[PDB]
Ligand binder design. Structure first.
Ligand SMILES: *[C@@H]1O[C@H](CO)[C@@H](O[C@@H]2O[C@H](CO)[C@@H](O[C@@H]3O[C@H](CO[C@H]4O[C@H](CO)[C@@H](O)[C@H](O)[C@@H]4O)[C@@H](O)[C@H](O[C@H]4O[C@H](CO)[C@@H](O)[C@H](O)[C@@H]4O)[C@@H]3O)[C@H](O)[C@H]2NC(C)=O)[C@H](O)[C@H]1NC(C)=O
Ligand SMILES: *[C@@H]1O[C@H](CO)[C@@H](O[C@@H]2O[C@H](CO)[C@@H](O[C@@H]3O[C@H](CO)[C@@H](O)[C@H](O)[C@@H]3O)[C@H](O)[C@H]2NC(C)=O)[C@H](O)[C@H]1NC(C)=O
Ligand SMILES: *[C@@H]1O[C@H](CO)[C@@H](O[C@@H]2O[C@H](CO)[C@@H](O)[C@H](O)[C@H]2NC(C)=O)[C@H](O)[C@H]1NC(C)=O
Ligand SMILES: *[C@@H]1O[C@H](CO)[C@@H](O)[C@H](O)[C@H]1NC(C)=O
Lengths: 132, 53, 96, 103, 118
């Protein structure tokens, strides 16, 4: 059984380094992929990206420079880091496990396939709001 | 031997002039794949054994 | 009709009629093109980009989309039209 | 989409298909967390109910739909599509919100 | 791989003109061959009627057939036909089309019983 515990400041100053933590329940951080997902109010969500051990750390090329993802194997948490919080960052944030899948449409040996991802579980989120 | 192009093609008539038709490629309906051929592994190994013999 | 007790020396390497078959197929391949349309007006400056595809930077797109001017049936009016071609049919004449 | 309870509804989302697609359908309760319903084109995981029919992603030139038969008031969730086309790039933002409500 | 198949009647009246026709597939008619007709009265041995050639041989029959047998080849239809004018009821026999080659009568026809009865 898994459920996540989001934790952040919630009240952020503009142009700041944001940090978030995500406590786990049961399954450790080594076993699974992890993802962060943001959603503004009354809007569709925005997939910030996924992190895993051994280099599987593909971020969103939207931000790609002012965002970082990490884990915590000792305390068994999942950490978000952000740089330079602007006014368009006020949203609700989620840490979430995710599972991959090989969609295969042609020859396997010709790389005619792709790995999609899907987030199975979620957490409580954190209503991160930026204001001076 | 089996050979295929799996890229589905749509031809498109472009009029070069009076009664001059040129046939270009339109849309790729579906996936963009690579054309390939297949041969049976065992029969090819057997025939290579025959030509080695 | 079979022939018996007859020994002839064959030589496929200095053989005739394979040269004649090559000449006949070459002349026939030429003779089935003179009705068809010459593509002299197609030699034109092509504005080509990659095909709309989620292409990796390693494996280049085999198919390039190309838009270009083309003369219509009417000599005064020209049209803008696009097509697809392979990498092995276009070269980069020489930003844009 | 507003339909009578205990009926079948069809909810469309996202761009028209270009190549083969793998679609993910999510659903969102108001104020609460998101939740998965469909992960492959027409595959649902354990712990979710049935009757979430997914459109097959093997069709070229169609829109990815989601059919739900025998709807309820518990199905009042903002739905989201997340398409993965073999031709289009990776969508880091989801589809637009398609809110299903009931009488 | 040659295949010969007879065609024609198997029940005719006596004192009439009998005629069969054997179709040939699997090979050509104009070969080093005698496309032949050979018969067999029932319960008895074979009886060679005659032949024709795909070259330019004149057809040579058994003289016991009393010059009533004309085998005519049809190279435009890959066939060759037996004839037998003025038949009797004692001429009831299985009929066979065959092909003499460098070996002796390799591909036959199946052989059909012509039972001449009034
Ligand atoms: C030359 O030889 C190669 C093999 O070396 C052949 O390549 C095969 O090509 C076919 C079609 O292009 C490939 O089939 C595809 O397979 C995918 C994976 O299938 C496996 O997994 C599923 C589920 O686990 C099993 O049921 C299945 O039995 C396999 O074990 C499928 O997912 C694909 O189906 C998808 O698309 C169709 C239509 O687009 C949809 O209807 C489906 O819903 C699904 O989304 C598809 O069937 C196959 O994988 C290739 N083999 C290999 C080893 O890569 C060439 O075809 C062959 N050439 C010739 C001319 O024969
Ligand atoms: C098809 O034919 C049209 C018509 O000639 C071509 O369009 C013209 O192309 C020239 C060459 O680039 C353009 O000149 C340049 O335009 C740019 C942008 O305006 C300007 O900054 C430059 O200083 C220069 O003037 C011209 O404007 C353009 N005309 C139009 C109406 O688009 C076209 O290139 C041909 N090919 C294709 C693939 O369309
Ligand atoms: C090449 O393609 C042909 C398509 O007909 C394949 O032939 C079929 O193969 C299947 C698989 O064994 C058989 O069940 C069918 O009976 C075959 N049909 C015919 C008409 O032969 C063939 O196997 C393919 N060969 C290779 C090497 O891929
Ligand atoms: C061909 O088959 C033989 C017998 O199984 C095997 O020893 C040999 O390695 C095969 N050749 C190749 C190239 O695999």
């Amino acid at each position: 059984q898994v459920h996540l515990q989001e934790s952040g400041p919630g009240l952020v100053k503009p142009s700041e380094t944001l940090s978030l933590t995500c406590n786990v329940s049961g399954t450790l951080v080594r076993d699974n992929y992890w993802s962060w997902i943001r959603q503004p109010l009354g809007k569709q969500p925005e997939w910030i990206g996924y992190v895993h051990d051994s280099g599987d750390t593909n971020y969103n090329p939207s931000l790609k420079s002012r965002v970082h993802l990490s884990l915590d194997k000792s305390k068994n948490l999942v950490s978000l880091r952000l740089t330079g919080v602007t006014a368009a960052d006020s949203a609700i944030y989620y840490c979430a496990t995710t599972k991959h899948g090989r969609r295969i449409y042609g020859v396997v040996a010709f790389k005619e396939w792709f790995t999609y991802f899907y987030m199975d579980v979620w957490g409580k989120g954190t209503s991160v709001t930026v204001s001076s | 031997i089996n050979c295929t192009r799996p890229n589905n093609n749509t031809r498109k008539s472009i009029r070069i002039g009076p009664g001059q038709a040129f046939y270009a490629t339109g849309d790729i309906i579906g996936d963009i794949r690579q054309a390939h051929c297949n041969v049976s592994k065992a029969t090819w190994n057997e025939t290579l054994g025959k030509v080695v013999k | 009709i079979h022939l018996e007790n007859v020994t002839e020396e064959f030589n496929m390497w200095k053989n005739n009629m394979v040269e004649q078959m090559h000449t006949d197929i070459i002349s026939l391949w030429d003779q089935s093109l003179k009705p068809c349309v010459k593509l002299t007006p197609l030699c034109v400056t092509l504005q080509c980009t990659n095909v709309t595809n989620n292409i990796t930077d390693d494996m280049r797109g085999e198919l390039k989309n190309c838009s270009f001017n083309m003369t219509t049936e009417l000599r005064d009016k020209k049209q803008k039209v696009y097509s697809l071609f392979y990498r092995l049919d276009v070269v980069q004449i020489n930003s844009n | 989409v507003s339909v009578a309870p205990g009926q079948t509804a069809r909810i469309t989302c996202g761009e028209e298909s270009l190549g083969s697609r793998s679609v993910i359908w999510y659903q969102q309760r108001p104020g609460q967390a998101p939740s998965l319903i469909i992960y492959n084109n027409n595959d649902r995981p354990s712990g979710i109910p049935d009757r979430f029919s997914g459109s097959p992603g093997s069709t070229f030139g169609t829109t990815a739909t989601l059919t739900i038969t025998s709807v309820e008031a518990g199905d009042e969730a903002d739905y989201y599509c997340h398409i993965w086309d073999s031709r289009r790039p990776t969508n880091w933002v989801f589809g637009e919100g398609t809110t299903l409500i009931v009488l | 791989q040659v295949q010969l198949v007879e065609s024609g009647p198997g029940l005719v009246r006596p004192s009439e003109t009998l005629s069969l026709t054997c179709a040939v597939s699997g090979a050509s008619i104009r070969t080093k061959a005698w496309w032949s007709w050979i018969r067999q009265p029932p319960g008895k041995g074979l009886e060679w009627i005659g032949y024709v050639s795909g070259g330019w041989d004149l057809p040579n029959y058994n003289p016991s057939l009393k010059n009533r047998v004309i085998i005519l080849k049809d190279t435009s239809l890959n066939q060759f036909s037996l004839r037998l004018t003025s038949v009797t009821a004692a001429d009831t026999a299985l009929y066979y089309c065959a092909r003499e080659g460098p070996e002796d009568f390799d591909v036959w026809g199946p052989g059909f019983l012509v039972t001449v009865s009034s």
